[PDB]
Amino acid sequence: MSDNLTELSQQLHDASEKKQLTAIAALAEMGEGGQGILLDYLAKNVPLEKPVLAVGNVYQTLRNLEQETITTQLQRNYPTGIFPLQSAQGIDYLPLQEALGSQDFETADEITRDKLCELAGPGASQRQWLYFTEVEKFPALDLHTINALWWLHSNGNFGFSVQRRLWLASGKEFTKLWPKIGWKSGNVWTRWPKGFTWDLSAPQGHLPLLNQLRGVRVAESLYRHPVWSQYGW
């Protein structure tokens, strides 16, 4: 047992950020010894000064074991998660992190729409859509925090940064991007969203949702926002 653990541990620490995930999955299933190695790795790499996907996968893989002991220990040691919940405008992202850590993407998606409205300010509360002019004025730090959380808790498959990359690969053509991320034309709402896939079986880039009731302008403004380049997304 010790041989594999040592090998797995060495992979987790030193292999390329491509083979780390493989070792994390195996360690999780190596009982207390493997989970212990995962826990020590977190302790040595948290809090994060930059989003590091392996750290998010280590934390989330441990949460996904759904063991009271492990979850409780993680709550005690990382009460606000593994990424500083920074805001430039007094926004509280703890409930968003908590929903993501519990893998409740539907609630995380609702909280995220509520936070973008909170950021937009006055007369956006409870609104089911943003205006592109509100998006252009969002602070970069908050969008970085929101995106980092989505990304770190979805093995890098969810997040506006992911949508933006697919958008760039689509030649910036929304008609090609939408089928790629699973947002069917005409599946738009005025009161509540329906027909989406609020779990990881969804396509890469599927969440967070951007209502297309008003067309592509808000998404374009968001993907063109300076935060992505600014923070290396």
Residue numbers in the entry: 1 to 233
Lines from the paper:
Analysis of the plastid-to-nucleus signaling activity of Mg-Proto in Arabidopsis thaliana led to the discovery of GUN4, a novel porphyrin-binding protein that also dramatically enhances the activity of Mg-chelatase, the enzyme that synthesizes Mg-Proto. Although GUN4 is not essential for Mg-Proto synthesis in vitro or in Arabidopsis, GUN4 is required for chlorophyll accumulation in Arabidopsis under normal growth conditions, GUN4 binds porphyrins in vitro, and GUN4 stimulates Mg-chelatase in vitro. Here we report a 1.78-Å resolution crystal structure of Synechocystis GUN4, in which the porphyrin-binding domain adopts a unique three dimensional fold with a “cupped hand” shape.
The crystallized protein (residues 1–233) comprises the entire Synechocystis GUN4 (SynGUN4) protein. The SynGUN4 structure was solved by multiple isomorphous replacement using crystals soaked with methyl mercury (II) chloride (Hg) and potassium tetrachloroplatinate II-containing compounds. The crystal structure of SynGUN4 reveals a two-domain protein linked by a 12-residue loop. The helices adopt a concave shell shape resembling a “cupped hand” on one side of the domain, with the back of the “hand” facing toward the N-terminal helical bundle.
